[PDB]
Design a protein around this ligand. Sequence first.
Ligand SMILES: OC(C(F)(F)F)C(F)(F)F
Ligand SMILES: OC(C(F)(F)F)C(F)(F)F
Ligand SMILES: OC(C(F)(F)F)C(F)(F)F
Ligand SMILES: OC(C(F)(F)F)C(F)(F)F
Length: 6
Amino acid sequence: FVGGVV
Ligand SMILES: OC(C(F)(F)F)C(F)(F)F
Ligand SMILES: OC(C(F)(F)F)C(F)(F)F
Ligand SMILES: OC(C(F)(F)F)C(F)(F)F
Ligand SMILES: OC(C(F)(F)F)C(F)(F)F
């Protein structure tokens, strides 16, 4: 699972 970037 690759986290998103805000
Ligand atoms: O989501 C993938 C998984 F499932 F963990 F292998 C990734 F390698 F990209 F992290
Ligand atoms: O999962 C959220 C997302 F979607 F990437 F914005 C978090 F901000 F936490 F990364
Ligand atoms: O935008 C993605 C979603 F859709 F929520 F899965 C993330 F995982 F990055 F948050
Ligand atoms: O990355 C932010 C988000 F999360 F999409 F709202 C930005 F506002 F910068 F687009």
